[PDB]
Amino acid sequence: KRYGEKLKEVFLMLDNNVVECIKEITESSRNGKLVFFVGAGVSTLSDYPQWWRLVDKYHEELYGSPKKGNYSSDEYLRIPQIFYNVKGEMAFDGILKDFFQVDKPTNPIHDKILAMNPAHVITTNYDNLIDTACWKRGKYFSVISAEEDVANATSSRYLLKVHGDFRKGFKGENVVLKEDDYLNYDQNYPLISNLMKTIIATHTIVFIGYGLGDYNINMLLNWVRKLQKDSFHKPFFIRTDPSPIENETLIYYENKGLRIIDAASLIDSNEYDYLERYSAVMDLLIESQENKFITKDDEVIDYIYGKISPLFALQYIRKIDLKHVFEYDYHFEVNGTVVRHKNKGFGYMERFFELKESCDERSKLSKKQYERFNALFNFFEKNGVICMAKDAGTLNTSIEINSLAYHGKYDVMKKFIEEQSVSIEDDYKKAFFLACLGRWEESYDLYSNIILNSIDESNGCVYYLSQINRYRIYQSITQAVTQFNGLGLLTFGRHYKPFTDEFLARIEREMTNFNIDDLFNGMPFEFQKKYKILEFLSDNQFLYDDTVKLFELTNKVRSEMSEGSYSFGMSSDIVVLLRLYDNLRFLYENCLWSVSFHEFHQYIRNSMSLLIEKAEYERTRDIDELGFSFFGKKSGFFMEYYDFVNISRHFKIDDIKNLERSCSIDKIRFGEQEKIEEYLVGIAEEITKQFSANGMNVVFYTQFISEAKAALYFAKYVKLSEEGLGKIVKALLFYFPERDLDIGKRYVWLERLTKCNELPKSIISIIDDFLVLQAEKHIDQNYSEVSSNGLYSRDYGALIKHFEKNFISKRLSEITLCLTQDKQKQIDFLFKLLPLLSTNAKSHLLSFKSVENINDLMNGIRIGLIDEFTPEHEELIIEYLETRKVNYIVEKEKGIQTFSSNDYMSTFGIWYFLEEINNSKMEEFIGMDDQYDFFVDPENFDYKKFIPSWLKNYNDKLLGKIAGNKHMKHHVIEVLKERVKNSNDKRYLEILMNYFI
Template sequence: MHLHSVYIKNIKQANENDRLAIFVGAGVSKSSDSDYRSLPLWSDLMSELKSDLAITEDLDYLKLAQLYYLEFGEQTYNQVLRKYFPEDITPSSLHRTILEVNPRVILTTNWDCIIENAIEQEGYLYDKICTDKDLVSSASPNKIIKIHGDFKNHNVVFKEDDYLNYSRNFPLIENYIKSIFSTHTVLFLGYSYNDINLKHIMKWMQSHSNSAPPMYLVNFKSDKPQESYLSNHGITTLVLDGENYSIDDVKNLDKRSALTQSFLTSIIKDDGEVDVNDEQDVIGFIYERIKHLKKLNSITHNQIRGAITNCGFRYDSDGLNVLELFKPKGVLTTDCSDSTRSIHEKFLEILARIDSFGEDEKDSFYRRNSKLTEILSILALAHIKGVVLPEANDNGRIVYFLNEKIDSAKNLEESDRKYISFSESECKSNDYIKYLSSGSYESYKLGEYEVAFKKNSELILACKRHKIYSILLIALFNKNSILWRLKYSFSNKNRSDFEKEVEVKLQDEFFKFPRSEIKRNQALYDFLALHSVHQKANDCTKKILDLTRAVESIKAGGISFNNYADEPTCTHINLLMFSLKNHIMIDQYAPYKAVMRDFVNISILRQSVKKIVKLNQYEIYSAIQFYPSKELQSELRVFFKSEDSNQLRLSASGGCLEWVVFTVLPKLTGQLVGSLSLFDGYESKFENCVRLLAVLNLSDAQVSNVMREFSRLIASDSTAVGTYEAINEFLAHQYELFDRDIETDILINILNTVIDKIISKTAHGWDQHAILNGSIGNLYGYIGVVKGEYTDKVRARRLVFELESYKSEEQRKFSKSLLYSIFKISDESVRNIIKAFIKVVISQSKTKGIDDWEFELWSFAVGFKDFDAEAISRLDEYLVQFRDGKIFSSQLYSLKNLTQYLINEKEVDALEGLNEELGDLIDQYEQRPNLSSI
């Protein structure tokens, strides 16, 4: 590598680390010369001073200025200086280029205001320092320091006394400048070898450490003695010439200024001094752009796109994608750079050549070019299976260089399942950072938020200590996620302990990073700040609308084309695994959850024109993890039993069904059974899993395992109405969609589990609510459908024995629900036991409230009691209270249904009058005006 390339690399690295200072001398100001206005030379000023003093001999200009000041006084002295440095000089492109480099510190010995004018015009943020007071009050890390003062502050440093008294007049600025030499790489621009200012600066440098960062002086003519002299003071001379730096594109500048601008441009440009004919340089260029990403366990497409630039992706139906590096005059992008694209073109030529190698030749090339192997490994972290090559096949399909560092899509799915199986992973790792990251994440998932907070705090300190900025940014984000749980979760009893913990202002922390790390981690920050998540949400909304229109068009006989049909699937996998593998605690943020749901919705919509919709494991995971239970139920309605001949079916890709039935469902059941809180979300995930399974065509073995998990859950004390309803739906859909023949023993076993909870007094309120309100009604129905028969007399006796201890009101409720449901599927001996109990309940005295009337009519309807004509007059008297419309009970609907049933099925015509009146009361209620109160 050319020495200049090494020096540029050092300067560029210093700038990325916020450790570059540029000294601007008089030569830079001369770049503002124009055809109608030329800045005077120092020699012009010296000549006027000598002429006014009538001095002919050569004097040091410091002494000359001192003599002029003593002879003519301060006012005349200042006037003559101002004449040579007008304030209205227009900055040149060189000044603007210096600002584009954006060094942390700009120092200048110039008195003119050209650089300040450029800062103001271009909108850069620099604090101007002309006095010690300015330095004390400066808040910005970016500073422009006028070390020789300026006319506005009346502190110009020029005459001999000014230099002799500098330490007394500018003590803070002098010490600050000296500190710059110890901490910053310094670049001198616009200084000649014999510049008196440079010599004065070198005096300050004499005491700085030998281990200080390098210093460079830009010049245009080689002078070995002078260069050796400067080298002894730690300054490396960079001689610029037309061979190394092209000035063809630089307009309106003299040659020296043009060469300086070209040199600065090479610092700004990301491609630096890359020799496109050098394989190592080209490969190294790509590697340098993405090497920072290898610290992460997974990478987003946006991170790759932002790091490499001038690139895009092709998406495949297997969920993987192919990187496309844009060539010159190719796809127009906002980051378009011809020089970068030229390097891309050479890189693609290298890949094309490797692609033609045999295996041994490939292995040899990879051993010689380890950076290429690293590039492929990093791309694999973003599920990139190859790089598009320039040639195209005859059939128009893309040809790509295969990334041998990535597994097949099938193997990737299998390896990814440990992240999406709702199970805990071991936090064993020799890497302390990874150990803390995974440990904090697992504690968070388990609801152990205080442990998670402690480990995450240790992770933040460790990342700061080792300067691992990407993981630090994630840990800072995770701190807020954990704090939210600690402060506001009802499951946390120690909320008050964390009330004073301050949440992280992620943007503020991010902008404290070194400039190079801000650039490298911009895509990660955009994701964590939810900027890119919101953008993806907008994209998904548009995609859903477009798909909806396309589906309607296709169903109406039209056609629709989409070259990016597989993009949502690839992006979904990428974003989901990025979050999970990097332990990002983003699952509680609504925009992220909405995007994950949208991807599932898009997949269903896109395939809805077919007869079968096939979901992959990532979509199944997202459906379980991110949907509210009722919303998923609504989403799945398209798969419910339909009389339409085009019945839409749901399927799962690959071995997903086995995975869901034998891994995911047992994990969710176990988590729900072991849950200590109503607010941990396990119930919703279990319900979602069951609702998905309900509309999937399962094998007998899979159904048996599902039913075993149901039995395990019902036997626990973690059941809720939603879980019973999900189980009920599973039975209904499995029968309606697939005419499923579930083994009687399995169904009876679940029923016995329910009965045993009543017998053992372990049935809690949700259990009883589900039993009494028909939330498991399909269980009895299924037993009847498969011609099952309940024959357990011992259990039946124990059940009625337990119910005998209940209050009359509860006995009536259980008689109508559980007992009668068992009665209908039992043999004669069990029926007799149940019937005897219910008859006793019927014979009990009643208060004749609405519950009593409902039970009595039910008794008539099921044939456990003969119809009593006197009941009509008693019921008529009871309904008096509702006739004025002031009060109403929803149970009147039930009474209406019972009277209608008795009329239609039992031919009790005497109830027609009451049935009609019940209908009138219900109509009167439903037609009442809507009232509101404040």
Template sequence: MKFTQANIDSIVTAQKNDNLTVFIGAGFSKFAETETIKFPLWSKLMEVLKNDLGTKETDFLKIAQLYYLEFGEYKLYQKLREFVPLHAMPSDLHTDLFQILKPKYIVTTNWDNLLEKTVTNNGLVYDVIKTEADLIKSSLPRKLIKIHGDFDNHNIVFKEDDYLNYSINNPIFDNFLKHILSTTTVLFLGYSYSDNNLKQIIKWIEKNSSISPPRFLLIKENNTSQNIYLENHGIKVLCPISNSEDIEYKELYCNFFAALESTMEGKIKLDDSEVSDEAIIDYFYANLIGLAELNSLLPEQITNVFSNCTIEYHHNCFGLHFHSNLMTLDYDSEIRKTYSKFFDIISEEERREKYMYKLYYIFSCFISSGVVFIKNKDTPINILKILRNKGQEIEENTKNDFYNFISFSSNMPRILFEFLTYDNKSEDNGDNIHKTSNTNIELFEKLSLDVVNNLIRQRYLSAMISKFNKSIIAKKLANSPDVDKQLQNKFRKEQHNDFTNELINNDNYPNSYKRHLKPLVDLLGFKSIYKFYYESVIDNEEHLSLEESKKNGGFGVTDKEQRSNDRLIQLLKFCANNNIALDSYSEFQNLMKSYTIGKIKIHKVREKFELTQVDLFILIKYLKFNELWNVLTKNILVFVKEELKEGSGSNIFLFSEEEKKLFERHI
């Protein structure tokens, strides 16, 4: 089932720009029906009221008004409650409404509580607005607004007077609705052409400027005269391109949400006769372009934007497996077909050559995350080899940054150098104290300015990194005795950042960018660090057990030997190349220490030590002297057969000359 793509694109663009409002009508509640729970049609409700009144009136609003005048408000509410099953539970489509569309505003004319239950059951961050007082007090950017009230607040809009006097009785709601209808893209779900509530909304539309974002109504019947009427009143009709009169409404909505989701995720509906090579390359390019501002990436940032893709661990590098046959939890046949076509393109030199500019960027993203091999079916492709065969090399501008970082060079990235030397500066005495405080405050102000400048330039990942670094320096200054108390209070307010909450609630970050921010948020909020730490411990224990078994004559293999090693090296590169002072925190330091000490224990069992420059860096930077001495004496020096003499240390370590010099210099 297909819809006009231009209309789908308009809705998706509004969603990405956080400018989408969805109006929910009575028809949407019927998706929550079960065999025993039903939401009656309005016509059935009116027939019951008419029978009680003994009238032949056909106007729904007048029937409601007459019932109110005849039997009073209490009886009217009692009758309405009988027809609205408040114990009903939301349907899957209610959840999809929030999780796929992610509207800024959801406005409903329904009295049931299905939408509120969806918010509560899924922990969604929406203010639920049932009265004008709720709207005044509302602080969250996202709102669920019940413009026709509910039973709990006894403010139901139903009878003729309620509609005629709505603007007088509900001026705040009225103005807010006019604002929404004139400034946001609007999607109507659960309404029909003849719906009284839709007609009321059309009147609101007519009161506003004719220049406004588009408005759409999803229906299944393609009725020309009705379409013309609605379009004359500023509402475009959304219906399937092919004949859809015989389909169920649930099928219509499921297909509609699927079309939106596919477009949002950049999925390609593959038809060999239609989809071009360029569209396939653009799919990869579009998913990665949001990461362009970073100097290095983590492989998890790649798999975050590509589903059906997992990380493989090689010797000092990663691989990416874009799955074709292996079942995964996120299995998606269309995406896997896209991957298959992508590999067909890059495997043929003539086809690959046409798109080398974009492929160069795609491959550079992979390589900056430590990925060298990619595969779809069986044989991995070495992307460095492809580029070298074309006479192209990935520029490694950040290589020196990482080397300078792990060699403690003063040429390391400036922010990291400032953090590295901060404690020594703070210990200065006398006349230097005031000067040092001013220098550190200047660093705080610089980071504050970086946040603003990055947001202005729409460099959202860099803005979040600057906020993180700023919070670290604020914490140090807040606890510095040589800083004025008034300033200390200012820094205390700046020392904590809830990046997860900020990602959800901060309007500074467009929805389209938030998926690129999530892995960074997980890292800066230590969620990834805890995960890596746990898996590092498991990897080392498994590897140690294997080595002990081999030493005792056993046999075994493990596929986890490289995982933690690759991860930690790439994590250090990511921090060094992107100026992230993550190692100011003990969580990061403990991760590094745990893995390296575990590695040394494994080498002790092997009776062969092959420590790298990165290992030495971790031992020197993150272990205290007593900790380092204990590691050396208990695990390495016990293998020295001769009396200790001055020398190169070649009887102890299998290091390169450069590594030996580095070790001697820092020990």
């Protein structure tokens, strides 16, 4: 328990040389290059049999008794050879089996040795204890004990059991024990030595379990000496003799090229405290594996400058992973509060902030440290690191800044692309901007050019972002080509191919069998160490943790909704908001292309959906008396320009509809309405420029027009200036791609824009020009008015009349005067706009044509020309229903369908129900449609055929009549209340509370 405390006392009492050596061993350990020469000393801790035991056994067998005297290093080897020769090899093998064949257990040192991620472990021991020691920790190793094992090298990590081992068998022939084997090693094992030399060459040997004068230590010493001067780092020696090392021996083996450490020099120990000594040194090194070298708080600025200065490269980094720079020592929370997670030393980070508060303390530093703190504080401010969590006062988080790519700017983008690229960062920005503009091929080639130039200048950050961007844009090119060749032909009728097939072959060739997931792994150890934050970008499964954060926080927020619980401090929605703006600022400031990918859009979309969902609930949240006691008049959720552009960019129009339906957006007031209007004016103008000119980059068009559609659709709430309204409408009607927005979507978007801001006479002129163009599109008989939302230019004219009580479009009137009988299609079109033309034009068209069939009758009544139903009109209705009846009895043997006739028949049923047409024949046609029976004769009609669409789709006057009739009023109220009780719906509740009860 307190062993760690006493050993930490030993640390920082250690001579600087020892601590620096320990840190070097740790750093090489992390690099997977550190190698260990573990000797019998470590195995002695296991009580493994010692060679002198077999030596004495051999002496007894030879001369009938032991030596009763110390064996020299030559004797330790010589007596075994005398036994091997005088007697033979058989009893040699027998004695090896008798002694070394033991299942000794490993000890703490055996696993500590493995805690350093040994690249290799070259052991001269003949034991199999060291093999198990490797599994103990988990490191894999390949055992080598002969020439043949040199082939069997499955891994990059070697347990080079040099001098042989009894794994072959307990035989002297299978090991190096007798003197001759030691002398003839260079000839007996060419290949083990072959490996041995190379591994010793570059890897950081660290000696342990050995005596300084050990024969194997001396062999390795001479072998490292054979290397070129200054071409080998001094390996280390974890010496653990109970006696303190003689200074002269220390000087000798430090000169020889070994970085030696004595446990006895670090601690005090007994004579048989071998395990204690090994543990002391190894555990000092292990505690160094954790950063505990933070000496004093006044030194803080140097430490933070070591950690943060290389980090200036990014234009911003997320505070989520800024903790990873300090290895989870200080968690930088989303709001900026720096939560202290761990700090072995005092003033690890907190002293930096106390300096930030106390300016006088900040004055105590050298101007070097002063400006160091200055730069680091500027970096933290860029990060939004508000204050240390412990002393953090009242906070006021704000919208994170984003780059111009986040803004709806494309003219600036092209200007800068035209402008000369000053340096590598300029070219990286140019590549991202070209990618944004749809010039994906130019961006890709520039990315490759900067790949070359960036490894040339050694900008690891810029190169690595360029690599990941190049892969991401290549994926975009490939998927775009697939989309084109697969579906664009069905879309346009003739698939384009902006990307040349040779270019696609080239880009596919340059990158094959290459996963960006391994891109960070393939980087230099320097870059990997100083840029561990950018590892998150390596994995192709982007947003590898932001999605989980969103999932958990969405759950929590829904739970808060359902529980109806108050909150104090920042809540779940606050952290969702903070993470969202952190991710946006990071990705757009760094100019990564990964934003355009679907997954990032989905993450942004879900976050904003949850944010607005909780925004709606807090508005209608009820407050208890104690709820009011804790807090009252809480801050409302806002919709700034930045949040608008999020909604526009990341949501689809169906998603915006879904969220508007679920949540009343109009209530939550919008912010930066002027900036919103300017950005919408920008979208409109860009569309005008792109569509008026024939030039329409197809990839760019697909990339951005979704943005414009969403912004136009979601612009229903924001106010626009008069000139802005002119621009936005002129974009919406004429220059908008007709392929995506049919006439109906066009009309309803214009109607929403009307709903917030009125259309002045200028906009009236714009829409009149659009209508006269539709007339000029109607000169050809082949032209057809066709929409998905059942909305036509007649509805546009209805809007103009709704705005202008009196409006005579002289263009339409002149057209009608110019129209002749042969232009009957144009006569029909101008008829739909009959209210909008002059009196003379009305008379002209009335002369040209009048009602003759049901379709023309519905046309006329929609225009309102006929103010009363003639007997001919009702008789025409009777004839049409006679046709429908014969068709239905004919269709009775078939399946019966009604999708357009049903509209006319429902209107006729309505008119019977409204006692407008007394005709009793429409009663005779009862039985065909459920709604027809419901209207013509509700009492006979069984009220089980009532549809939910009927329950919610309605008319005000029709609802009044329904309430007025009691027979259908009972049934309809019953089913409607039943449905709202089943599923609470706003329309159902309104229909309940307003017309019947």
